[PDB]
Amino acid sequence: PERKRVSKLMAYILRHSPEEFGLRPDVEGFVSLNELVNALKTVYPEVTEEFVREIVENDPAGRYEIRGDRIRARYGHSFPVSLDHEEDTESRFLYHGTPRRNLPSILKEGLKPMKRQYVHVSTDKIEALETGRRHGREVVLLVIDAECLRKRGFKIYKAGKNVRIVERVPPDCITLAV
Numbered sequence: 043p044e045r046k047r048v049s050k051l052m053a054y055i056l057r058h059s060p061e062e063f064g065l066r067p068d069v070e071g072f073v074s075l076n077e078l079v080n081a082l083k084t085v086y087p088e089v090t091e092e093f094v095r096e097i098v099e100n101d102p103a104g105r106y107e108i109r110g111d112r113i114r115a116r117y118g119h120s121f122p123v124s125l126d127h128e129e130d131t132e133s134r135f136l137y138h139g140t141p142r143r144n145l146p147s148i149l150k151e152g153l154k155p156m157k158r159q160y161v162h163v164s165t166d167k168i169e170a171l172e173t174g175r176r177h178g179r180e181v182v183l184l185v186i187d188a189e190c191l192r193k194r195g196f197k198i199y200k201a202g203k204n205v206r207i208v209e210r211v212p213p214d215c216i217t218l219a220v
């Protein structure tokens with residue numbers, strides 16, 4: 043209950059609107075941990091640094107990263123950020139879940155970042171489908187040839203446990219839609 047509310051607000055601050063709370067993330071997307079706790083307290087005042095450190099440690103998707111006294115979101119940003127994730131050179135197939143209503147536009151334009159900086163995909167079929175279900179009920183599973191992306195210059199990076207980021211996904215690299 044309360045853990046999900048604080049995590050949703052953390053993602054809003056660290057991915058989209060930090061300046062709304064007086065925060066200035068560095069080029070790599072990090073903000074001061076102390077600054078984040080004080081920002082969160084203006085909405086939920088009974089939050090501590092230990093409560094936030096428990097969220098980061100127990101995050102099932104690996105959303106957040108703490109380097110000492112700093113904290114950032116690892117992906118999902120809507121403002122420019124210089125990330126240092128490792129490249130995914132092993133995956134052959136990647137997956138992306140999206141409402142079926144988006145398929146005609148995707149089959150002509152490919153996957154675009156839209157309001158975010160990068161296109162997000164997954165190595166896990168269940169995670170991709172759950173991600174698509176956020177936007178609507180009827181969801182299709184897209185299968186993406188990873189080597190198709192690499193041969194066209196689009197490197198894939200390991201942003202989370204199963205989450206992967208890439209600049210875009212041309213339609214020719216989408217092999218299947220189920």
Ligand SMILES: *O[C@H]1O[C@H](COP(=O)(O)OP(=O)(O)OC[C@H]2O[C@@H](c3c[nH]c4c(N)ncnc34)[C@H](O)[C@@H]2O)[C@@H](O)[C@H]1O
Nearest residue numbers: 118140141144147148151152153154156158162173177205
């Ligand atoms: O942690 C969460 O955030 C990550 C991003 O989630 P996604 O659902 O992948 O993206 P999001 O920005 O919220 O939604 C964008 C939406 O737009 C669709 C899309 C992509 N490309 C096109 C084109 N060309 N035309 C029309 N629509 C689109 C995407 O499929 C998506 O539904 C992720 O890690 C998630 O867990």
